[PDB]
Design a binder for this molecule. Structure first.
Ligand SMILES: CCC1=C(C)/C(=C/C2=NC(=C\c3[nH]c(/C=C4\NC(=O)[C@H](C)[C@H]4CC)c(C)c3CCC(=O)O)/C(CCC(=O)O)=C2C)NC1=O
Ligand SMILES: CCC1=C(C)/C(=C/C2=NC(=C\c3[nH]c(/C=C4\NC(=O)[C@H](C)[C@H]4CC)c(C)c3CCC(=O)O)/C(CCC(=O)O)=C2C)NC1=O
Ligand SMILES: CCC1=C(C)/C(=C/C2=NC(=C\c3[nH]c(/C=C4\NC(=O)[C@H](C)[C@H]4CC)c(C)c3CCC(=O)O)/C(CCC(=O)O)=C2C)NC1=O
Ligand SMILES: CCC1=C(C)/C(=C/C2=NC(=C\c3[nH]c(/C=C4\NC(=O)[C@H](C)[C@H]4CC)c(C)c3CCC(=O)O)/C(CCC(=O)O)=C2C)NC1=O
Ligand SMILES: CCC1=C(C)/C(=C/C2=NC(=C\c3[nH]c(/C=C4\NC(=O)[C@H](C)[C@H]4CC)c(C)c3CCC(=O)O)/C(CCC(=O)O)=C2C)NC1=O
Ligand SMILES: CCC1=C(C)/C(=C/C2=NC(=C\c3[nH]c(/C=C4\NC(=O)[C@H](C)[C@H]4CC)c(C)c3CCC(=O)O)/C(CCC(=O)O)=C2C)NC1=O
Ligand SMILES: CCC1=C(C)/C(=C/C2=NC(=C\c3[nH]c(/C=C4\NC(=O)[C@H](C)[C@H]4CC)c(C)c3CCC(=O)O)/C(CCC(=O)O)=C2C)NC1=O
Ligand SMILES: CCC1=C(C)/C(=C/C2=NC(=C\c3[nH]c(/C=C4\NC(=O)[C@H](C)[C@H]4CC)c(C)c3CCC(=O)O)/C(CCC(=O)O)=C2C)NC1=O
Ligand SMILES: CCC1=C(C)/C(=C/C2=NC(=C\c3[nH]c(/C=C4\NC(=O)[C@H](C)[C@H]4CC)c(C)c3CCC(=O)O)/C(CCC(=O)O)=C2C)NC1=O
Ligand SMILES: CCC1=C(C)/C(=C/C2=NC(=C\c3[nH]c(/C=C4\NC(=O)[C@H](C)[C@H]4CC)c(C)c3CCC(=O)O)/C(CCC(=O)O)=C2C)NC1=O
Ligand SMILES: CCC1=C(C)/C(=C/C2=NC(=C\c3[nH]c(/C=C4\NC(=O)[C@H](C)[C@H]4CC)c(C)c3CCC(=O)O)/C(CCC(=O)O)=C2C)NC1=O
Ligand SMILES: CCC1=C(C)/C(=C/C2=NC(=C\c3[nH]c(/C=C4\NC(=O)[C@H](C)[C@H]4CC)c(C)c3CCC(=O)O)/C(CCC(=O)O)=C2C)NC1=O
Ligand SMILES: CCC1=C(C)/C(=C/C2=NC(=C\c3[nH]c(/C=C4\NC(=O)[C@H](C)[C@H]4CC)c(C)c3CCC(=O)O)/C(CCC(=O)O)=C2C)NC1=O
Lengths: 172, 282, 185, 162, 172, 162, 172, 162
């Protein structure tokens, strides 16, 4: 698991030398916008359950063949597993947001997920659609302008979108 | 080299032994970790968890060793792996889940299989649980972990290769894998054949490279090959799909190519879309 | 050194497209891709010998023991086996030494690549390939042409592309033309 | 033909290059050995008449059945004896040609090429020629390095027949 | 492609008669004159590029029609080709010198050379002039004796001139 | 040659398919960019003599040390001066063809192909022509799109020579 | 393909230093005993056919299971293969004797031999027995003191024995 | 490597044939020339430092502009002078390697292996090394057969650079 600071340190360790002024400025930019990062992760974590539940209802309304008899989201055991996996993707994306780097997202959660779903038979494209539903929901929840001291946050919202996108593309 | 190989972070050991053996929170973690390692990261539903064992577990009447054995011999474990797979494959899974390694030589299968044939499965699990390896690496108070990655114990080099056949990623579970329902390390184990390391998928295209030596070139060139200056590099590939004349045939395969031609061959392979698994000198 | 002087292609059966099911005159396709048993691999090896060298000249001394062992252990592709036949010393003595570059282009194209020369201009066009690059390099590019990779993939023995109502190349082309017969009585 | 000079030339032609010093060294060695080679060839050819007849009688002695039991493959008839003389003469003539050429080229082109194919069709046992060539290798009457060259070519033929 | 020894052996094989004493002494004479042959090929090969280039410089000016627009040597590509073919002829002639016979010159070259140029549209007469100019260059460079023990190598020069003449007459 | 139109035709022919809208769009782009290129070609042909004269003097001044050494590969003699003028003119003459063809085809067909062997055998340093053509490149008298497209072809040739 | 001279050059190139006087002395010793080397190669190649044939007869007399039905040298096709491989090993050993080093032997006929025979089922131990039979026969014919000039050849004999042994050790 | 020995071995290997008398004759010629070859190599390495130093000064005198004109290709700094010494040392070391190998193999594998490509990408001029090799060819201080073979290899390098 690498976070942003750790990522810069690891590159600098590969090249030896000593931390350049540019790298220092980059990390200073990260810390001066840190309060924003923490607020976003707090908002997403606080509504995790409703995000997953709403996205799940939408997925099963849009693609009914999944929950029809004989489909992969049938029999109430596989339904539990599907809800579990949606929540797990959300959890590791939340980890990534707090870290500031997508290394955690690709090192544990997306590490092997593709072949897992390929072997199970679960349609990867549908999982990607579900992740995108969660993407819109979570980004809206975090970008809600009421409830906190106002200020520019669009960069962080785009970063959140980037994490969700990485997961959705890797599953599909 | 951590992320590509798959070992994201397996870099500590979770004991439960404490004055506060429950520790009010740590025991929850230990129970989860045992479920992840013994049941092969299977998604156990809440209703079918082994509540009776956890009762004794917090009480201190049973140690972590007893908890691991209880899960291993409980029908929860049997339904996933024991009943449904070839017996040798079950031996491989036992080695992966209980001793955190892969079979180092055929004698392992001989011994464990004979136990199963005469004494019964319960005795087989018993042998894994109380083998010197389990007693040492783990300690009746330490959840089993994949120590096959680390080489400290003393093991055949092939072991490293072989463990990467069983572990196909952090997300993966042995109930659900590319080559599942059939032996994954059986043909190789009899011939003591090494295996190329298949990296697990990570936000890029994956093509699980099966390596049956029934129809592949030998690991070595076994000749002068083309005879051009330089040795003969063996190039593997999996996802050949574009040029299907009868259907391409043997989509996953290797070609022994002389050094000078490698570049040309490489581009050809890339054109078909197969991602080269390995390029090893022969 | 020079981009090979452009040649004008002529209409030919091989160039044409045709939606035909195989005839009884179909060339027959010896493919090592299936990795057939050793006995059938013998047939495949024999067909390649029969193509690069003619049926007439494939004697014991011509037979390369190494090649026989090559195509038996799922080694270098049938294409590379063909190239090995082509660059072997016996081939150079039997074909290369007995013909001029201009006729050599024709002979090698008919046998190795399996299509007749497009026109006299093409015979000229690849004669220099033989000269500057060397005969070994000429056959290298001859079997490394994009056309070849489409025609016979890798593990397919070369065959006359389609001799539809056409004399087979082997039965119309001698080992060497009468021009060299001046050195004979 | 597989003549040292031509072999060097062909090696240079494969790489499309003017004759490098390596090839020139090789042909120089050929010229330096040519004195002994040509003297050996002269010795063998001026003694050829005795050698050919002696080899014929040697094979008649080693394989008496070849002189008695009837068949076109055998020398039971005077015509067959003529055939035997003709063919052993072929072998001797080819060895002298190879001696003067400096390589195995001549015998490979005029004798060894397809030798196995025809010696089975006409049912001429190779062992007969083997014994004849052994006689010639014992009575060639050469000495020193001349002798080593000639015997090398003779044994090349012997191993090819086998 | 034969050599001197192989040539005499081939005639003897056609006749079917053991090598005659006369043939033996002929080949002995050929071996007697081996060192000069080797010297000549070594000297010509060390200066090959300069020889051909110097002759070419003069050739193009003495025959201006070729380098004027619309002529066969015009354009960069065809000029490159003319240089290439001059060097090709020089290479096969050097082969012939080492062999001791013109067999190689007539086998893989000079067998239909005139017809090839005539179909290409190259004036054969100009090619003949080029070959003769090359012939003069080669005879000069081999026949500039200095740096080695002298001898009467005029025979070698005459046979080299014969090879060049054979080519010139075959192309025109 | 490597004309945009011709390249589209060849790409369609190797697939064996009728001209799809992709190829038609490409040729349309060629026609749309053939207004400025043809203007530039007209301009450079109408002032061709003056610009070749200027370039000739430019190379004479940049390389007076070649302008004074006597030899076949030099312009020191009046005959060599005439040769230098004609070859500078050749470069301009090919650049106009390149402008009209809208591609690098003329460059490869009339030059570039085998530039290395020529610059090795005659050893006529490409730098001579390069300096002359840079003079042309600034003094061509084109503007805007015509200028930038012509400059693109010119610098392609310059970087190809090296 | 590296012979003794090439091996010395390659090591010196790895170090980047001119050959030391010691290396020069070693190669001078090699060339001063070169006639012995080429004489041994000549004797081995002159009796190659008899060497392989006699050794084959001996192997099948010592281990009859090979030629009994079912054994791996049965059905006359596998018998041909067995004789072919024996003579192949002899040929590559002869190459190694001329070269002076075992590089060719270890690169082109020993590299993958063990794995191929293991997969085929060919008994490697039996192959080692066969090559040792050939070893004794070839050693004797090359070391015969009658028929050539007397001298010392023991170092060369030890070298040829070493190469046969190398092959035997790799195949079994 | 294209050592004469290994060349003969490869020629026999492509045909799967035992070493014939022709190959043995070639290798014997190699060994005959090797006495002079080794003497020459010992001579060159005994004077190695003197030869490289002298060649360095020779190119400094022949091309004085290289010791003043600014540019990475020029030795206007101590590191650049070191690079000049290093490269002429490479050439001398390769010559000694080729002398002991008895062929041009080493020269082709560790040099003359894209020498044109590298000098062109860096834009370094071949003429530099050609003149350096000329000095070495004149100052080698050999006589007899050794002299002719060593100068032959140096000239091989010279003509290969062009
Ligand atoms: C428990 C550890 C901990 C956390 C989590 C934490 C968060 C935190 N982030 C802050 C700043 C901020 N909060 C925002 C919030 C936003 N403005 C917008 O227009 C968006 C709608 C939204 C992005 C989600 C911004 C832009 C700042 C930066 C300005 C500042 O620092 O006061 C502030 C001060 C003012 C505020 O409450 O917003 C706190 C306390 N502080 C802590 O000690
Ligand atoms: C052989 C089968 C079996 C039994 C019988 C058993 C008993 C058992 N009950 C326990 C807990 C407990 N059991 C109770 C039970 C009660 N609390 C009350 O107020 C009532 C009077 C009473 C129920 C009628 C409580 C409160 C605990 C929790 C103790 C704690 O964690 O603080 C514990 C402590 C560890 C744990 O919770 O796992 C054990 C071992 N465990 C077993 O495996
Ligand atoms: C699904 C349950 C299961 C099966 C079936 C199985 C097969 C199996 N049979 C084995 C041995 C064997 N099996 C045989 C079988 C036979 N030999 C013969 O001649 C007969 C034709 C045939 C019996 C009729 C032999 C000879 C061996 C020993 C092989 C050896 O040691 O090399 C081995 C080798 C390891 C060992 O001996 O412990 C396995 C894995 N393993 C299993 O877990
Ligand atoms: C912590 C990172 C991590 C992930 C992500 C992971 C995935 C994962 N999901 C699984 C199952 C599953 N995954 C799904 C998923 C879905 N089915 C659908 O219809 C939907 C489209 C989709 C949800 C969006 C289902 C239905 C199963 C159960 C299949 C089964 O056990 O039979 C399984 C194995 C079978 C089991 O549950 O025992 C794994 C290993 N494992 C991990 O360790
Ligand atoms: C003669 C023996 C032979 C076999 C057996 C063979 C199989 C074979 N089927 C292929 C394709 C394929 N095969 C399938 C088959 C299926 N798709 C599905 O959705 C189903 C689950 C399943 C059928 C029920 C598909 C989809 C492809 C194309 C894969 C792709 O383009 O990605 C390919 C890939 C290359 C190609 O398409 O040519 C091979 C090699 N080829 C052969 O020459
Ligand atoms: C690089 C040069 C080279 C070597 C050395 C080589 C070995 C070799 N020997 C083979 C066969 C064989 N080799 C044997 C050998 C033997 N059987 C016996 O009883 C003896 C003890 C022994 C002879 C000494 C047999 C019986 C086969 C046939 C196996 C088969 O194809 O069924 C095969 C299998 C394919 C083939 O026949 O070509 C290889 C690859 N191949 C090569 O290309
Ligand atoms: C399948 C149909 C077919 C036929 C008919 C055919 C004929 C044919 N016979 C040839 C050679 C030959 N044919 C003969 C035949 C004869 N010599 C004699 O003294 C007799 C009068 C006559 C036998 C009755 C000879 C001697 C050669 C070899 C000529 C040489 O290489 O010099 C060649 C030369 C090219 C080569 O060797 O492959 C051809 C093409 N080839 C074919 O593919
Ligand atoms: C120049 C290359 C060359 C060779 C080698 C050659 C050999 C040759 N020997 C032959 C036959 C023969 N060769 C012999 C010779 C012998 N009879 C004996 O008793 C002895 C053991 C032996 C002498 C050592 C005999 C008897 C035949 C006739 C076979 C028959 O009619 O069945 C034949 C068949 C035609 C014929 O009967 O003449 C050929 C072609 N021809 C050639 O052009
Ligand atoms: C077997 C030995 C051999 C020869 C002889 C040979 C010659 C040869 N030279 C050619 C071209 C050419 N040859 C020349 C040569 C000349 N240009 C002139 O101005 C002069 C009149 C003349 C030199 C004196 C030229 C200009 C071309 C190019 C023709 C063109 O593309 O239009 C071509 C046309 C096909 C091609 O370019 O590949 C051949 C076959 N190739 C060979 O392999
Ligand atoms: C249409 C495309 C085309 C080009 C570009 C071309 C180049 C070209 N330039 C040449 C020569 C030449 N180029 C020069 C040029 C110069 N001397 C100097 O001092 C200057 C610095 C320099 C002017 C920049 C000279 C003097 C020659 C004659 C050399 C000779 O014939 O030996 C020649 C040799 C034959 C001849 O004189 O024409 C060619 C082929 N030929 C072509 O067909
Ligand atoms: C590696 C290839 C190779 C070369 C290059 C070679 C050259 C060579 N030339 C020699 C002599 C000689 N070379 C000549 C030749 C000539 N007489 C003339 O008028 C002409 C100018 C010239 C013909 C080009 C003569 C007369 C001798 C001295 C006597 C002799 O050796 O026959 C000698 C013997 C004495 C000496 O070393 O000088 C050698 C070794 N030997 C070789 O093995
Ligand atoms: C056709 C190629 C060719 C061959 C074959 C050849 C042989 C050859 N071997 C020689 C020497 C020799 N050969 C031996 C050989 C041996 N000593 C022993 O004890 C062993 C039994 C035996 C090893 C097989 C010895 C000791 C010498 C003399 C010293 C030496 O030069 O190596 C000599 C020099 C002295 C003499 O005339 O005998 C020659 C010419 N020269 C050639 O150009
Ligand atoms: C063993 C095979 C081999 C060769 C041939 C070789 C040559 C060689 N010389 C180089 C550079 C160089 N060489 C010099 C040397 C010189 N300075 C001068 O004034 C002289 C005129 C000249 C000596 C003749 C200089 C200055 C550079 C650096 C040029 C640059 O950095 O651009 C470079 C570029 C990489 C580097 O900086 O070293 C190579 C590759 N290196 C090799 O490994």
């Amino acid at each position: 698991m690498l976070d942003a600071f750790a990522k810069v340190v690891a590159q600098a360790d590969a090249r030896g030398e000593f931390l350049t002024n540019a790298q220092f400025d980059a990390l200073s930019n990260l810390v001066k916008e840190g309060n924003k990062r923490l607020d976003a992760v707090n908002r997403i974590t606080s509504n995790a359950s409703t995000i997953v539940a709403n996205a799940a209802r939408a997925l099963f309304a849009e693609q009914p063949q999944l929950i029809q008899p004989g489909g992969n989201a049938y029999t109430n055991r596989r339904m539990a597993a599907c809800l579990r996996d949606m929540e797990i993707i959300l959890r590791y994306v939340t980890y990534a947001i707090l870290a500031g780097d997508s290394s955690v997202l690709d090192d544990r959660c997306l590490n092997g997920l593709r072949e897992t779903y390929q072997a199970l038979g679960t349609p990867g494209s549908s999982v990607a659609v579900a992740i995108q539903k969660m993407k819109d929901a979570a980004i809206a929840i975090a970008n809600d302008p009421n409830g906190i001291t106002p200020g520019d946050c669009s960069a962080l919202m785009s970063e959140i979108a980037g994490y969700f996108d990485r997961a959705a593309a890797a599953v599909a | 080299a951590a992320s590509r190989l798959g070992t994201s972070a397996f870099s500590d050991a979770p004991p439960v032994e404490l004055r506060a053996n429950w520790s009010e929170e740590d025991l929850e973690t230990v129970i989860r970790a045992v479920y992840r390692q013994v049941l092969g990261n299977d998604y156990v539903m809440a209703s079918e968890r082994l509540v009776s064992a956890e009762s004794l577990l917090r009480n201190g009447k049973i140690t972590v060793r007893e908890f691991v054995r209880a899960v291993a011999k409980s029908e929860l474990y049997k339904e996933k792996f024991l009943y449904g797979n070839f017996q040798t494959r079950v031996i491989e899974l036992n080695y992966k889940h209980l001793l955190g390694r892969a079979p180092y030589d055929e004698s392992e299968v001989i011994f464990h299989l004979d136990l199963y044939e005469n004494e019964g499965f319960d005795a087989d699990i018993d042998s894994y649980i109380d083998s010197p390896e389990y007693t040492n690496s783990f300690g009746d108070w330490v959840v089993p972990y994949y120590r096959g990655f680390n080489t400290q114990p003393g093991q055949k080099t092939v072991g490293f290769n072989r463990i990467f056949r069983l572990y196909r990623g952090y997300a993966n579970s042995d109930r659900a894998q590319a080559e599942g329902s059939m032996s994954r390390l059986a043909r190789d184990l009899a011939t003591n054949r090494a295996n190329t390391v298949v990296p697990p998928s990570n936000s890029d295209t994956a093509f699980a490279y099966y390596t049956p030596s029934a129809d592949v070139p030998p690991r070595a060139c076994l000749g002068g090959s083309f005879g051009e200056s330089g040795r003969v590099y063996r190039i593997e590939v999996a996802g050949i799909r574009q040029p299907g004349y009868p259907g391409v045939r043997r989509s996953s395969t290797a070609f022994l190519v002389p050094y000078e031609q490698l570049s040309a061959k490489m581009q050809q392979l890339q054109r078909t879309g197969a991602r080269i698994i390995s390029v090893n000198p022969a | 050194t020079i981009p090979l002087l452009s040649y004008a292609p002529s209409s030919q059966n091989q160039r044409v497209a045709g939606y035909e099911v195989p005839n009884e005159e179909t060339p027959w396709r010896y493919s090592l891709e299936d990795a057939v048993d050793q006995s059938d691999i013998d047939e495949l090896i024999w067909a390649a010998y029969r193509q690069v060298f003619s049926e007439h000249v494939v004697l014991k001394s011509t037979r390369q023991p190494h090649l026989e062992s090559q195509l038996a252990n799922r080694a270098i592709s049938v294409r590379d086996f063909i190239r090995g036949l082509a660059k072997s010393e016996t081939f150079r003595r039997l074909v290369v030494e007995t013909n001029s570059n201009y006729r050599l282009v024709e002979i090698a194209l008919k046998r190795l690549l399996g299509r007749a020369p497009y026109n006299k201009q093409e015979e000229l066009a690849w004669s220099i390939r033989i000269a500057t690059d060397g005969w070994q390099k000429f056959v290298d590019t001859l079997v490394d042409s994009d056309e070849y990779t489409q025609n016979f993939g890798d593990n397919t023995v070369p065959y006359q592309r389609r001799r539809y109502k056409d004399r087979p190349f082997n039965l119309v082309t001698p080992r060497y033309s009468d021009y060299w017969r001046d050195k004979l009585e | 033909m597989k003549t040292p000079i031509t072999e060097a030339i062909a090696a240079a032609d494969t790489q499309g290059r003017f004759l490098s010093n390596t090839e020139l060294q090789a042909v120089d060695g050929r010229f330096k050995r040519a004195v002994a080679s040509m003297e050996a060839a002269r010795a063998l050819t001026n003694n050829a008449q005795s050698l050919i007849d002696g080899a014929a009688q040697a094979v008649y002695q080693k394989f008496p059945y070849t002189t008695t039991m009837q068949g076109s493959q055998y020398a039971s008839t005077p015509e067959g004896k003529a055939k035997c003389a003709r063919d052993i003469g072929y072998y001797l003539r080819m060895v002298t040609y190879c001696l003067v050429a400096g390589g195995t080229g001549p015998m490979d082109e005029y004798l060894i090429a397809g030798l196995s194919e025809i010696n089975s069709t006409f049912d001429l046992s190779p062992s007969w020629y083997i014994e004849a060539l052994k006689y010639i290798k014992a009575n060639h009457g050469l000495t020193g390095q001349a002798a080593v060259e000639a015997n090398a070519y003779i044994d090349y033929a012997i191993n090819a027949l086998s």
